[PDB]
Ligand code: HEM
Ligand code: HEM
């Protein structure tokens with residue numbers, strides 16, 4: 001992804017304050033509540049019948065930590081998102097066949113969660129930089145489809 | 147794009163029957179009629195106010211021949227779509243900023259035109275072969291976004 | 293949102309399918325299964341082989357639901373509530389698959405009804421299928 | 434298709450937004466222009482600088498249109514007929530742009546509603562915005 005020196009700085013600073021134990025689960029949880037067809041890929045996770053069950057689902061939280069860990073990986077390798085996500089791309093594309101639009105959705109839900117957490121601090125400029133990052137991540141994950 | 151030997155032969159056979167002066171214009175015209183927002187990219191073509199005006203527009207037919215031609219080049223280089231469309235990709239992505247979803251729509255419209263012209267000859271197996279081709283073409287066109 | 297012209301086009305074109313219901317529905321499904329193999333995950337216990345009797349029977353239900361949708365074009369959520377329960381609540385079909393089946397229905401129609409598949413009609417049918425798709429993928433009950 | 438629960442959530446959430454609707458619409462527009470620069474080509478004669486009076490004035494209009502939609506949630510096509518003509522027939526806005534503006538409105542709401550942007554509210558508002566987007570991008574006259 002592009003990201004100017006200052007954007008990289010803004011992105012890095014905001015990420016240093018992101019709860020590694022919760023944000024991922026909140027993003028995955030909101031994806032499951034807002035775009036319910038995505039629940040089809042998580043039957044082994046248990047009860048996802050209500051927003052409360054989803055957000056409190058222990059498996060969603062634990063799994064979300066891994067998802068967040070992957071974004072942290074991308075943020076540490078902005079110049080090579082495709083390589084960084086290569087393994088995950090084969091998993092999501094060749095094994096799971098997740099439609100790529102869903103990668104875009106989760107990225108935007110993550111942006112919403114960051115906005116929810118940081119409030120006014122999640123300024124338009126900061127959001128613009130993060131949109132470049134989530135788009136890069138979605139593209140990288142969909143690589144096996146290209 | 148990977149076409150089995152059988153698919154490549156069926157795709158080639160059908161394409162050899164395509165009217166090179168009409169099919170492109172028909173596909174481009176249907177794209178402008180079925181997905182009206184695409185007209186915003188072609189206002190310099192003149193009157194596109196109604197389905198008949200679009201399909202009978204001389205500039206739509208003329209430009210259509212070029213589109214068909216690019217598809218023909220594609221079919222002749224199924225092995226190297228990225229390279230074959232590298233220039234067009236810069237044009238469509240870096241300059242026109244055409245959302246990649248629209249590349250998929252034009253490919254599917256072309257498929258509807260082939261079906262329209264060849265009827266029963268455009269069998270399910272032949273369609274499957276053509277879907278690989280148009281998905282590869284759209285992919286190569288969106289390469290600058292990857 | 294369908295215009296009056298869209299409804300007129302859809303009823304005029306779809307009405308020509310008639311008794312070809314099962315054949316055409318079956319063909320659209322087959323085109324989808326062959327063209328987009330991932331869609332097959334939704335039909336694990338089905339025999340998806342070419343002239344499958346199962347695909348033919350199911351294709352007939354799909355086509356008849358569409359005929360029904362056309363009749364209640366201005367009242368689809370109510371008319372198709374049971375189908376919504378099925379696809380959205382129970383099956384959880386990803387909306388992308390509806391674009392795929394819709395495209396395969398358009399291909400099928402274009403291959404069988406060339407005189408009827410004019411650019412205007414093609415556009416109306418796409419909107420109609422998109423509308424049906426929204427209802428079936430929405431949870432509104 | 435919005436369920437009774439979605440409608441209740443949308444009316445309650447937009448009610449919470451309240452008098453800040455116009456401001457949020459303007460911030461949503463600003464986030465869109467900055468995050469997705471291609472959208473700016475739709476506003477060639479506008480001053481899109483941070484805090485421009487033109488964007489604030491336009492944000493108000495967008496907000497008021499949404500408020501109008503919320504109040505006629507069961508009959509949006511009719512209530513938004515004039516806006517649909519403008520966006521779908523005259524401007525021919527690519528629907529992708531509606532997903533972008535909707536996302537930016539959701540991001541704006543999330544940033545301003547730490548105590549009320551619940552997952553259910555987020556879900557109902559997303560569906561509401563998708564519905565509005567469908568009406569505005571459809572030509573149904
Ligand atoms: C776009 C960002 C995404 C990232 C960064 C991401 C990341 C991950 C990671 C790190 C794993 C676990 C890998 C491992 O340690 O084994 C994983 C697995 C998986 N992901 Fe994603 N994912 C994303 C989007 C999606 C979407 C949009 C869907 C579905 C709608 C999805 C569904 C799955 C499934 C099905 C598995 C878990 C399989 C299981 O344990 O049952 N992912 N993902
Ligand atoms: C399958 C995908 C497509 C192919 C194969 C294709 C091919 C082409 C070709 C061959 C040219 C002219 C190249 C030159 O000689 O300069 C062109 C131009 C152009 N294309 Fe596409 N195109 C595709 C999709 C699209 C779509 C979906 C849109 C927009 C909705 C679009 C918008 C344009 C425009 C605006 C031009 C310039 C036309 C002019 O003003 O002369 N293309 N395309």
Ligand code: HEM
Nearest residue numbers: 331334335353354357358375383385389390393394424425
């Ligand atoms: C144009 C939209 C569609 C229509 C009108 C439609 C209609 C129907 C109908 C009428 C039923 C059968 C109910 C019965 O047995 O009476 C059904 C079942 C089913 N549909 Fe669809 N459908 C559509 C799209 C989809 C899509 C896109 C998928 C997935 C690719 C899908 C997957 C299924 C599955 C899995 C079943 C249940 C089959 C079984 O196990 O018996 N449908 N659909």
Ligand code: HEM
Nearest residue numbers: 472475476494495498499516524526530531534565566569
């Ligand atoms: C939630 C969706 C949206 C709503 C409710 C909405 C609402 C409105 C309203 C109320 C106006 C002012 C109409 C008047 O002057 O009477 C307007 C104008 C306009 N809208 Fe939207 N709009 C939406 C999305 C979009 C999108 C996605 C774009 C393009 C990125 C767009 C482009 C425009 C433009 C270019 C104008 C005309 C501005 C001018 O030249 O004065 N709108 N919109």
